[PDB]
């Protein structure tokens, strides 16, 4: 036989990097005292169409993730005015934390919470964070309720993650935008079900 | 390089019967016998206690029978919802905070030789299904059981009330009567969860769907709606939590 | 310290890419898993599950019950066969919705043999026979029980069988196939024909119904994933 | 020299890692340790210390020397518990300030057993009896002393023994849980019932005093650290 | 890669019974017998010489009683400041630059049989008090010792003077006294410093604490006050740059 | 048992890296001939309240410093004139020595204080700082006297950080800050106490 | 070539640091040291040398 | 375990010890007690019956009245 049946394996057919998110900060003018902009968002796969649609297949999984970060600015006004080298931070909030509210909050400071600060012009930053669950293995469909005469299909916990600028502002304002790229590794899925139609898919298994 | 192992660079399907793994184990005897050689195990997998128990809940505990007309849609129950109310399984179900259990379900058909039609079982694990729109009030109908309905809480049949077709259904563990060839079923359903131990009372481990695949037909002057009976019988159980009453 | 030359390609991302990462949450304990009982390592292990073709995908008996059924009804035949379907398995519109079709959409070349099972859903009093026909690739389908009759084909006896089992093998010039082709129009062809009427003993009803199932042997392939998914409006 | 490619995630500063860094003040010999007595190598350790439960953080008497008591008085009694105690141990205000529950506000998950003991302060020439009733999680606590009579429960006996101890156990679907939490409205109770009135011989006081002390068991364990604590305004 | 070593890429504490540990030292014999054996001895460490002397201050020093009444709330001690006057040790103490010797403390209370309440003893290292405002005349009262007070210099009971609860106290070695149980109570105290040896004169080394956990109660007409009354041995002393006088 | 103690550990509890302190300076303008700023901090924990809460669980303490610098710039007026990369000093004053001044002055130049020097827009600069001490241990409490008839709780030395812009002044006022990440390593701490209550804390045991 | 990551502390340069420099003149031929009688590896050696205790600071 | 090393000076009436019937709850082999009684300086005297006092408490009340002999 001289043909495999690698390619259809769990890993290959999901451990592929895909965009899940783009978030944008920037950096406003020195004169005009506005609020600096700052990213959340929470981690969840039910916004892109085709990891969702992999997923459903089955019921229940187990993965972790790698994480990796694709930054890019623009001036957003025709000034001659121009601006140093940026530093933005990137903060993971793991699943059961505060989250910040404030471009200048004590949430930017708690040793719990680990950051990234990735200066602008080099290489992406990546990491990777472990399985994060309670269970033994995430539950893309639930058939239970939280209290007995309550919410009907548990939700998963992933975590948080928030983005700034540490550089203060400019003369000159700079828009940036970061595309976040996720990949599941070391992926394990138990007891297949069949796969739904493209119809906007739904929030729940609600059609 | 790094020690913490976060990055580091990187038959049994198909429905299997009885006699394939596990034959040595022919303890059902006594509602059927002779039938519980050609019965199917769910993922290959036999209900087994909790490694490194009561006896009355051991019982079968026959439902009512339902009525299989030349109009009828198809029917569903949740387990273990559907014995809540059924003597000392569901006492204990109901004074304990944590159990665990398998089920055997048998279902079967009473027909003559010049009925036609063709009925399939399935074992949806987590069914969560869904109407055209739910309350706690939906999702638990008892042991009386819901109907399916074609084009109150209703799901859709051809979708198996979940947005998924039909068709496909034959990935759960699923089984066949055709009333030509066999008119009996049994499902020998192990305990499936993402815990090893969870609350009976707020969740539903298994649901079990019944769908006619082909229509009734009968010879004139014939009994004109045949009866279905399901015969449930806990496996392996055990609970821990004990409360009062 | 160490004298270094940096080749072309550094400082790059490529989505494709298996390189060791930094973990952000280390000193953490993860839950460890449980033997949790339907363990799934290949999605072609999905594809050897048969599921009933979708016969009548018209508008009038489409996405309902009545689409997986073929009546065998009393009026006479033509001598026309009672159900040709074609092996393309990702460009049949009544083969492409099975599981079969759905994981064959996910990917590009495919190869391996097929299997179909029919199953009869009449009475137990009802007698006859049926010819189940398999047209090779490149051959137009056969139009008369004859023309059938000479190729190859098997008798299934409706009375003493209720299911009939049809394996369709590999047959291509190239190791592989593409799942999406236009032009092919070949593939080969599963045709049932009428060999012999069907008898009742009494009022019993001469209106029968047949149903389909298809799998995937333990002998196919996939490969050169492809997903084009998309919601967008 | 060697060729060489740059990965992905260089250049950059992860506040979690763990690399080797280049010393600022080699050529420098540091005072070297001594056997101090009172080693500290994990922070369980001060989790296994039992601590005073202050029992009326009522605003009459809120932090002062009066919250650790719990009276008996000579007045009768309606049947209902002496004290009724909930087991969220960083979810109750009467259990949040302890050791136990200083070490639980630094983490997230949770999972082991706990150890209550009560002190009798009182006469030597009393007697009586008390009931000390445990409820397991998902139950509301019990009203009347004969409804904690039919559950898990233990007399302790005023009068030959001092102080009594209940070991609470772990249950849990999942291995973990959150410190944090709500809607949960479990995890059981410990009441304490007169079982039988209280008996001194002469004008002895009939008011006395219990204290109560609680503790982490040799199987507790914590994980996911979380830190919150800020002063800002 | 690199040589300094600054950057390579990376039942004790309960308060232990004597006879856990160390039983074949009874050598404690006269001021009291068969209570050495329910003794704790702080972190599971006993007194000893300093490896690779005095003998008149091997006795013991019983400092004057204390009254607890129906309104104390507590009293404390620094030691060594406590022995400063007590003959041959605070001599030696005085004429010398540096100094080092655990403690034996043994606390006694006279009750009847018809008194109630509870003591706390704990033994603090480097029992830094504070009031509610410190000068070389508050840290350092002498044998007289102190009183903590409720809502000069007094810190808050149920603060131990330092910002932390009463509750948490637990964490020092301690003791309690139940007067319906045993009216007793024994801390054998190891040297404890970040230095090997230290000057006496300016250092305090431990502290004691006796706090009312339950308040003083009596049978009518009994003596309205019973007293307390501490004795403290040395042990293991020694002491060097003897100076004149 | 499935179940492990290690994320409780002396070493997770605290060895976590928190920002200390902001150090700020400047390269004026070449045209106004005011004096360059230059940034001067003495190392201690007595600002940061989590760090600092951490620490008073315990009365005897003993650890390593990892010190990472975060620096950051910008222009702080809008003119066509720009400036060349940028080069800064970090010098670390180890305890007992003199502390600069003035910008310009023998302690930028003493062959026993290192420094960094580090060029604006790389990699963060890093070092690690040994146990400097004279007694075996330093101590967070303290109950005793300099002089007996002052202070009442010893004070522990950690050393100092100065840091300057080597570059001469531009035609333009460039304004820039540093982040000072520290990280303890191979801490052992001795003799628990209970910990202190949020009431702004205090400079010594005083409340 | 080889995967490489770069992590922080790198294109710096710290006063204190002990790594191989490049040569300048290499295949050069140094002359050799002799055997120069008084020769100092420690400074303390040069503590241990007895030396006379001014007495008298006073200005006269 | 109500009480220990009271029981070796019971009384066994007639000098026999329950038995079996030779040629089972768990549950029920609890201590079940009852409320107490005021002693006073009027009291009379006081009496139960047996198994009648027991016909309210938990399983064993359940068996006594779900079974035709006991």
Same mark, same amino acid.
């Given at each position: ?207 | ?39 199917? +195990? ?158 009976? +009372? ?44 | ?233």
């Amino acid at each position: 036989q001289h043909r495999s049946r690698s390619e259809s394996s769990i890993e290959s057919f999901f451990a592929r990097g895909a965009c899940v998110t783009i978030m944008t900060v920037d950096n406003p003018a020195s004169t005009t005292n506005k609020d600096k902009l700052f990213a959340v968002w929470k981690i969840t796969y039910k916004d892109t169409v085709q990891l969702r649609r992999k997923l459903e297949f089955f019921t229940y999984s187990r993965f972790d993730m790698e994480l990796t970060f694709v930054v890019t600015a623009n001036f957003t006004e025709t000034n001659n005015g121009h601006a140093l080298n940026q530093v933005y931070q990137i903060m993971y909030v793991p699943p059961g934390a505060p989250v910040p509210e404030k471009w200048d909050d004590y949430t930017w400071q708690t040793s719990s919470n680990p950051s990234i600060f990735y200066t602008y012009g080099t290489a992406p930053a990546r990491i990777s964070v472990p399985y994060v669950g309670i269970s033994n293995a995430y539950s893309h469909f639930y058939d239970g309720f939280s209290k007995v005469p309550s919410l009907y299909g548990s939700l998963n916990d992933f975590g948080i993650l928030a983005v700034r600028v540490v550089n203060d502002p400019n003369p000159t304002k700079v828009t940036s935008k970061i595309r976040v790229y996720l990949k599941p590794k070391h992926i394990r899925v138990w007891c297949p079900r069949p796969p739904r139609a493209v119809a906007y898919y739904g929030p729940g298994v609600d059609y | 390089y790094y020690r913490d192992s976060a990055s580091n660079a990187a038959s049994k399907f198909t429905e299997p019967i009885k006699d394939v793994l596990i034959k040595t184990a022919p303890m059902l005897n006594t509602i059927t016998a002779q039938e519980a050689a050609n019965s199917v +195990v769910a993922y290959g997998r036999w209900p087994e206690y909790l490694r490194d128990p009561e006896v009355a809940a051991c019982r079968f505990y026959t439902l009512d029978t339902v009525s299989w007309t030349k109009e009828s849609r198809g029917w569903w129950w949740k387990l273990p919802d559907a014995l809540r109310d059924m003597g000392l399984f569901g006492q204990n179900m109901y004074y304990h905070y944590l159990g665990r259990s398998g089920y055997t379900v048998h279902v079967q058909c009473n027909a003559s030789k010049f009925h036609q039609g063709a009925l399939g079982v399935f074992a949806v694990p987590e069914m969560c299904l869904a109407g055209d729109s739910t309350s706690y009030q939906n999702a638990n109908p008892g042991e009386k059981g819901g109907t399916f309905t074609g084009t109150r809480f209703c799901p859709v049949d051809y979708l198996l009330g979940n947005g998924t077709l039909l068709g496909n259904a034959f990935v759960f563990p699923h089984q066949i009567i055709n009333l030509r060839t066999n008119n009996c079923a049994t499902l020998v359903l192990p305990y499936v969860n993402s815990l090893s131990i969870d609350s009976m +009372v707020k969740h539903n481990n298994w649901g079990i769907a019944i769908l006619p695949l082909a229509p009734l037909n009968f010879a004139s002057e014939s009994s004109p709606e045949i009866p279905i009976t399901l015969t449930i019988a806990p496996m392996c159980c055990e609970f821990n939590g004990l409360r009062n009453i | 310290g160490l004298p270094v030359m940096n080749t072309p390609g550094s400082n790059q991302y490529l989505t494709a890419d298996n390189f060791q990462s930094p973990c952000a949450l280390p000193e953490f304990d993860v839950t460890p898993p449980i033997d949790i009982p339907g363990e799934v390592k290949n999605m072609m292990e999905l594809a050897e599950i048969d599921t009933m073709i979708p016969f009548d995908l018209s508008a009038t008996k489409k996405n309902t019950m009545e689409m997986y059924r073929v009546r065998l009804s009393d009026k006479p035949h033509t001598d026309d066969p009672i159900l040709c379907l074609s092996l393309s398995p990702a460009s049949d519109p009544r083969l492409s919705h099975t599981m079969l079709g759905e994981i064959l959409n996910y990917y590009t070349h495919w190869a391996g043999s097929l299997k179909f099972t029919f199953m009869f859903c009449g009475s137990m009093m009802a007698t006859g026979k049926l010819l189940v026909s398999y047209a090779p690739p490149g051959a137009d389908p056969p139009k008369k029980r004859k023309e059938a009759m000479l190729g190859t084909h098997v008798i299934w006896d409706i009375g003493l069988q209720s299911s009939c089992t049809m394996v369709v093998p590999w047959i291509s010039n190239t190791t592989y196939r593409l799942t999406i082709d236009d032009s092919f129009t070949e593939g080969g062809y599963i045709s049932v024909f009428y060999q012999t009427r069907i008898v009742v003993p009494l009022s019993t009803p001469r209106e029968m119904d047949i149903l389909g199932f298809v799998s995937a042997c333990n002998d196919f392939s996939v490969r050169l994933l492809r997903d084009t998914t998309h919601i967008e409006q």
